Ligand binder design. Structure first.
Ligand SMILES: Nc1ccccc1-c1nc2ccccc2c(=O)[nH]1
Ligand SMILES: [Zn+2]
Lengths: 47, 161
């Protein structure tokens, strides 16, 4: 993996075009996330 | 040392996780190419992932970050979709789970929109879709996402399209 930007622990990808999109985030150390919940699902076909 | 505990649909913990999953679906600029065409999910199961060694690894790093950031871990709950979900829950996140070609460099990517992480369940850009039908919009096959506790610390803000 790459390193975080100097003096930072992650990157936040802010949306600048799509008004409805929420943020995305990047960490560069696996120890900075814990997989709390495992969700099993199907996507549903729109009616 | 991972065990998975099923949550009952009557449990408020099940209900709050399902609500975050459903309420953060959006439309995608690809028209559904990567993740499929849908407005909501059928939640089949929610399991708590319990691993003491991996939890302690997380909290150790979280303390390091907090102490570098005026006692503020800047901890979030975020979605992660990946073909390596089985490896992650047993062995933890590491460099093998990074997105090498990601727009913010080679790191591990998480989303506030569950539907964004849904685009990565079958690989980058949805890969070739589900293993059984080769369909990125498969309505039959069971998918899995992780809802993860993530330490952001001081986060570099990138404005981007
Ligand atoms: N791109 C990836 C490659 C391997 C494993 C996971 C992903 C992945 N990338 C994302 C990029 C942006 C927002 C969310 C994600 C994600 O959940 N997984
Ligand atoms: Zn399928």
């Amino acid at each position: 993996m790459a390193h975080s930007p100097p003096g930072h622990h992650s990157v936040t990808g802010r949306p600048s075009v799509n008004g409805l999109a929420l943020a995305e985030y990047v960490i560069y150390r696996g120890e900075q996330a814990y997989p709390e919940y495992l969700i099993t699902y199907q996507i549903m076909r729109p009616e | 040392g991972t065990i998975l505990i099923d949550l009952s649909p009557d449990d408020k913990e099940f209900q709050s996780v399902e609500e975050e999953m459903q309420s953060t679906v959006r439309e995608h600029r690809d028209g559904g190419h990567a993740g499929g065409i849908f407005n909501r999910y059928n939640i089949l199961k929610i399991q708590k992932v319990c691993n003491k060694k991996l939890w302690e690894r997380y909290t150790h790093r979280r303390k390091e970050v907090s102490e570098e950031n005026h006692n503020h871990a800047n901890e979030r709950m975020l979605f992660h979709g990946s073909p390596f979900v089985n490896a992650i829950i047993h062995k933890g996140f590491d460099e093998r789970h990074a997105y090498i070609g990601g727009m913010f460099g080679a790191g591990i990517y998480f989303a506030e929109n569950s539907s964004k992480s849904n685009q990565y369940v079958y690989g980058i850009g949805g890969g070739t879709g589900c293993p059984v039908h080769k369909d990125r919009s498969c309505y039959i096959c069971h998918r899995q996402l992780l809802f993860c506790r993530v330490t952001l610390g001081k986060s570099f803000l990138q404005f981007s399209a």
